[PDB]
Design a binder for this molecule. Structure first.
Ligand SMILES: NC(=O)c1ccc[n+]([C@@H]2O[C@H](COP(=O)([O-])OP(=O)([O-])OC[C@H]3O[C@@H](n4cnc5c(N)[nH+]cnc54)[C@H](O)[C@@H]3O)[C@@H](O)[C@H]2O)c1
Ligand SMILES: NC(=O)c1ccc[n+]([C@@H]2O[C@H](COP(=O)([O-])OP(=O)([O-])OC[C@H]3O[C@@H](n4cnc5c(N)[nH+]cnc54)[C@H](O)[C@@H]3O)[C@@H](O)[C@H]2O)c1
Lengths: 217, 217
DNA sequence: TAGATTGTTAATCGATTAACAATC
DNA sequence: TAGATTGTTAATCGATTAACAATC
């Protein structure tokens, strides 16, 4: 359980995103008026959400883009730095390993790990792939903050444990399993496996209620 | 805006997943009682959610795993078939293209597209990479249901449009951009670029309110 | 200044939980 | 059958919206 309501927290990187578009375009200031306009949210929510972390607004003025942006940056914690590792140098593994946008925002890939020894030594974007046996130790030596999980779901909770045990601070989970972690570990589930299904679901939904509303009268 | 509340819809793939674990272990039946136990949700919510699509339950008995599972299948619309294409044969592109579990559940890769001709013809898991010029057409000839977007964000709304125009039914969106689609197009955003930030945010949150609760008294 | 727009509290809306009568 | 567990309605909780007095 976190201090701010999660519904809100999930909307923060979104503000961060739009605010930076405005900053990038030399727009000097914006009002929640115009922002909710632009983001298709309610002007209340915006003022509402923001006023969990204080007033960045100025009556009569609106919000100074540069100053609010720079503040969301600090709120999302992106003024700091995060050492990350990837477990599972697979397809997804490597695609995530190659992607560098994350770096810009503070997240530095320190290591990649796999069981399959063919891969040991292999270098992706200049981080070498290492035996996942040594992970528990490497985490401890290198103050690893986030572990990115891209190994097959099978018996993976075991590996998740070894991570937690070794003092990993949060896990980013790409497997289609709900993992079990301690209270002091942030688990972020992705679950494409699911997200996709809400699409197949939405596509069929409208016809699925002729299938069920043709069941009473 | 959809018939069932979204909050619910997003939990459906989750039930589906659990139910299938049970089915896999020959467990003949389960009660919302034991399920909310196993899933760490409230027994009401389960019964609650499910009774949007009818009573698969039996008083005194609970839920027949097999029959409930098979019904979630039908609800999530995983009893039909979906033609999918991928735009952008990059890292993520190919990673998603190579992943075959999606097929098992109804989703069939019919094509992959790129602008860079250096890829044209190249075959991934036996679909060959084609010029994204031809996509508008290929969508129409092959009744493509979902387009998976894995192109760089820059100017992508243009490409998005082309897809919509050609009558794609939904887009699965992996770019860190909010796209604009018509009412009759299902847009599913992924936004790893965000989800990750809720982790850096959570890591710094507890200290961020010492930084702000040391600001009044 | 005075018109504009925020911080913030109050009213509404939706989603979760709890309760219980119906029933297998 | 009778103990168990659902379908469903009612009570609670949380999140979104609306409103307005404070203030730049
Ligand atoms: N790839 C996708 O498009 C996609 C979509 C949804 C979910 N996933 C999940 O992503 C994870 C991997 O998918 P992928 O990268 O396409 O599969 P992959 O390419 O087979 O990756 C598996 C990698 O993990 C390695 N490995 C296996 N076990 C371990 C272990 N215990 N410790 C360290 N390394 C290990 C294995 O050698 C291989 O390199 C799986 O859990 C999928 O279920 C992937
Ligand atoms: N890879 C990740 O780890 C990751 C994480 C978060 C977001 N993303 C997003 O995923 C998308 C692609 O990432 P990636 O695949 O790693 O980059 P990539 O590996 O450079 O893939 C880009 C591919 O798309 C092709 N392309 C460019 N423009 C077009 C176009 N207009 N139509 C069709 N194809 C085009 C391009 O030639 C290349 O093959 C980008 O939108 C990223 O922002 C990726």
């Amino acid at each position: 359980k976190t201090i701010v309501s999660m519904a809100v927290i999930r909307r923060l990187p979104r503000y961060h995103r739009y605010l930076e578009e405005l900053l990038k375009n030399d727009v000097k200031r914006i009002s929640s008026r115009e922002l909710s306009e632009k983001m298709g949210v309610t002007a209340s929510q915006i003022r509402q959400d923001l006023n969990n972390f204080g007033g960045f607004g100025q009556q009569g003025y609106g919000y100074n883009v540069e100053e609010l942006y720079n503040n969301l940056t600090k709120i999302l914690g992106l003024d700091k730095t995060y050492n990350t590792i990837i477990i599972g140098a697979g397809n997804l593994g490597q695609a995530i390993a190659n992607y560098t946008s994350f770096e810009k925002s503070g997240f530095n890939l320190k290591g990649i790990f796999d069981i399959n020894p063919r891969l040991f030594g292999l270098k992706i974007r200049d981080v070498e792939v290492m035996d996942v046996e040594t992970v528990e130790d490497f985490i401890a030596r290198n103050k690893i903050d986030i572990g990115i999980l891209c190994i097959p779901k099978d018996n993976a909770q075991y590996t998740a444990d070894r991570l937690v045990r070794a003092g990993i601070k949060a896990i980013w989970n790409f497997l289609p399993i709900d993992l079990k972690v301690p209270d002091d570990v942030i688990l972020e589930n992705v679950h494409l496996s699911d997200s996709l299904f809400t699409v197949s679901y939405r596509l069929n939904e409208e016809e699925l209620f002729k299938k069920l509303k043709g069941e009473t009268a």
